[PDB]
Each structure stands twice: as C-alpha cells, then as structure tokens.
Amino acid sequence: EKAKRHEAWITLEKAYEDAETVTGVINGKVKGGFTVELNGIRAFLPGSLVDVRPVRDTLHLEGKELEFKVIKLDQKRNNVVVSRRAVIESENS
C-alpha cells in the first residue's frame, strides 16, 4: 500500500495546519537544496542556512538522519517543502 498513500496524504493537510512534526533522511542532494523522504513525501531544505562559510567537515550535508519542522506546504506543485530556520534542529537537536 505505497501508492495508496497518495490519496491518504489528504489527511496530512490537517496535520501541517498545526505545524505537524515530521522525520526523514536526505535521499537526494541538489544545488543548494536537499531532498528528504518523509513518510513517502519529498521535502526540500533551503541552502540559505545549509552551506555558508565552511570551517570544518561538511559531510553531514548528505545522509543526515534528523527530523524537520513543517512551516508551509505547496500543494500547487503536489509537493512539500521544509522551513529554513528549522535547520537549527536538523543540524543537531
């Protein structure tokens, strides 16, 4: 029942409404952005608060297994994004 979740996502809408918390790991990495699998859904992390003024090892950018903070979803593109400031938690709760 993997595809069935597609229609079940309709219930998640009410969840994000109250800023529901999620949890997933980064599967794909793009130029500045970062794709993460959250319950089957694909998230997007802003690079604005990811890569900047490197001082130490930055290999944690990919493969990081941490939670995120939903601030606003874009159903228009049948996709969901992640907050930038929320990175404060993803970095190291």
Residue with tokens 């997007």: 44
Strand 34-38 to 41-44 pairing = antiparallel
Other Cβ atoms closer than 10 A to 87: 19
Element (H, E) at 16: helix 12-17
List the structure tokens of 49: 């608060």
Q: Structure tokens of 33? A: 């952005």
User: Residue 46 and residue 28: Cα distance in Å, rounded?
Assistant: 13
Give the span between the Cα atoms of 21 and 29, in whole angstroms: 22
**What is the rounded end-to-end Cα distance, in angstroms, of the chain?**
32
The string of DSSP codes covering 77-88 is GTEE---STTHH
Question: How were these coordinates obtained?
Answer: NMR
